[PDB]
Amino acid sequence: GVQVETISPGDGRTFPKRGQTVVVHYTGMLEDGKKFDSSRDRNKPFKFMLGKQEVIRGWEEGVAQMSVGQRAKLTISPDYAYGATGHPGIIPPHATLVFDVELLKLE
Numbered sequence: 001g002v003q004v005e006t007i008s009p010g011d012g013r014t015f016p017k018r019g020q021t022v023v024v025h026y027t028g029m030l031e032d033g034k035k036f037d038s039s040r041d042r043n044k045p046f047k048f049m050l051g052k053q054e055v056i057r058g059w060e061e062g063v064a065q066m067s068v069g070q071r072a073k074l075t076i077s078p079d080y081a082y083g084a085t086g087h088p089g090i091i092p093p094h095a096t097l098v099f100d101v102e103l104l105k106l107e
């Protein structure tokens with residue numbers, strides 16, 4: 001599944017709703033601890049629309065469990081990410097992924 005742990009609290013009340021655009025900063029790490037992606041390098045937040053399934057399942061479900069302003073650690077099992085095959089050259093087969101995610105705004 002996806003586990004969500006608070007690093008810094010959000011407002012506790014404003015949770016993403018289906019069809020809203022979710023605006024975040026993130027860093028993604030493998031189980032070996034290595035960073036494979038981050039929006040922070042780009043100085044431009046990442047945006048996705050909740051419900052479009054245009055991010056992996058653990059994001060669709062995990063970021064929906066965050067309140068605006070929260071920074072959270074998401075631990076995502078392979079079946080909620082890239083599964084048996086992974087994404088060759090980037091994500092190993094059957095990989096658990098760890099993200100540091102900050103929910104900046106909803107639009």
Ligand SMILES: C=C[C@H]1CN([C@@H](C)c2cn(CCOCCOCC(=O)N[C@H](C(=O)N3C[C@H](O)C[C@H]3C(=O)NCc3ccc(-c4scnc4C)cc3)C(C)(C)C)nn2)C(=O)[C@@H]2CCC[C@H]1N2S(=O)(=O)c1cc(Cl)cc(Cl)c1
Pocket residue numbers: 028036037046053054055056057059087090091
């Ligand atoms: C834009 C990066 C996100 C990649 N994804 C989705 C969109 C994804 C895309 N892909 C296709 C293979 O992309 C490998 C490189 O990913 C980094 C990247 O910048 N991708 C670009 C990308 O996907 N973009 C650029 C824009 O942000 C829009 C987006 C895009 O084309 N989205 C369409 C799309 C494509 C595939 C999927 C998939 S495939 C399996 N599940 C899904 C949901 C869902 C939606 C690129 C393909 C145009 C170059 N596989 N997964 C994530 O769900 C998750 C969660 C949100 C943040 C990123 N990840 S990730 O950090 O786990 C990640 C980073 C990298 Cl360097 C590589 C991977 Cl495989 C995963």
